[PDB]
């Protein structure tokens, strides 16, 4: 039965850990956001076919450019994430994440994931960004970025509401089959 290594990369601001915890436990962790998500595997059925999905977190490694690639080899699919309410994390897709992922795993599929979808319509978030002469990242921006990096899908999700979250991972699997 088919094994799938999925590595999740992106800035600290994406909430990689929270994402994975919320997907795996079926619930936003709420009270306390743990900093530790240990390498995970579970069976899921996709398009009928059952599959063994491996998830690796990378949080903590954001400042260690030579340590991060230690997780890259033999990856079946990357989730490259940015927070939809951080223009900087978006720009880093282009500036930092796509380059090193391509440099090490040139023929590995990428899903581009916009996180914190629930904050894109939040007045306080919106206002905190307008004060910095910025706005949240909207859909066509994600699409355009995905095109530019050769991402197979651009997907948006919330660890909070679970909106789009199961789909992110369905599609990570579909991109390998």
């Amino acid at each position: 039965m088919q094994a799938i290594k999925c590595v999740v990369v992106g800035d600290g601001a994406v909430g990689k850990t929270c994402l994975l915890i919320s997907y795996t436990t079926n619930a936003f962790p709420g009270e306390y956001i743990p900093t530790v998500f240990d390498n995970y595997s579970a069976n899921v059925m996709v398009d009928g076919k059952p599959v063994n999905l491996g998830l690796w977190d990378t949080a903590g490694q954001e400042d260690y450019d030579r340590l991060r690639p230690l997780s890259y080899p033999q990856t079946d699919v990357f989730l490259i994430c940015f927070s939809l309410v951080s223009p900087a994390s978006f720009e880093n897709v282009r500036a930092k994440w796509y380059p090193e992922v391509r440099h090490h795993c040139p023929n590995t599929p990428i899903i581009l994931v916009g996180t914190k979808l629930d904050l894109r319509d939040d007045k306080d978030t919106i206002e905190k960004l307008k004060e910095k002469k910025l706005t949240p990242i909207t859909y066509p921006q994600g699409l355009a970025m995905a095109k530019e990096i050769g991402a197979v899908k651009y997907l948006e999700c919330s660890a909070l509401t679970q909106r789009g979250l199961k789909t992110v991972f369905d599609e990570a699997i579909r991109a390998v089959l």
Partner: protein, 179 residues
């Protein structure tokens, strides 16, 4: 409350890390050193290259560090000192990371399904590769937990900043040591 949750995570994740290294050592490592099973010649007597100094890292955590962290359970604002105390021992993460690429190449090029067979046999969710990234993960994680403590511990927080300093400096040193 937040300081208590973080400490609890530090402790629970430390326990699991010790469990995970132990598991690695007594499955993937033990099969090779045992001499119970058929060992691909491309890796024979190269367990040094595969597992680097993971034994010594496990021994640190299992003999000392976990016991000392436990002592700081009700002292989250002071746990930074634990890292200061035991800083030199963390230098062995530099050696480990330096070696990890060589470990990975070796396993691709010469190990075939040796370790997969062992994984299947023992019923392990984690592959040998999943176990072997863990030291790299763990050594970048401690700084996260210390930063989290800092967001919620008062001006009694130089007993964290030095701890954090240490745990920022170990992974940077490991980073800067890579080819």
């Amino acid at each position: 409350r937040k300081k208590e949750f973080i400490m609890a995570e530090l402790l629970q994740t430390e326990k699991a890390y010790v469990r995970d290294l132990h598991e690695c050592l007594e499955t993937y490592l033990w099969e090779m050193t045992s001499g119970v099973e058929e060992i691909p010649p491309g890796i024979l007597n190269k367990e040094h290259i595969i597992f680097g100094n993971i034994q010594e890292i496990y021994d640190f955590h299992n003999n000392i560090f976990l016991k000392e962290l436990e002592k700081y359970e009700q002292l989250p604002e002071d746990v930074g000192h634990c890292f200061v105390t035991w800083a030199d021992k963390f230098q062995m993460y530099v050696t480990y990371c330096k070696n990890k690429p060589d470990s990975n190449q070796l396993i691709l090029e010469h190990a075939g399904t040796f370790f997969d067979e062992i994984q299947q046999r023992h019923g392990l969710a984690n592959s040998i590769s999943s176990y072997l990234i863990k030291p790299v993960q763990r050594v970048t994680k401690y700084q996260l937990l210390l930063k989290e403590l800092l967001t919620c511990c008062e001006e009694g927080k130089g007993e964290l900043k030095d701890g954090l300093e240490v745990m920022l400096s170990v992974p940077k040193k490991a980073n800067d040591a890579m080819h």
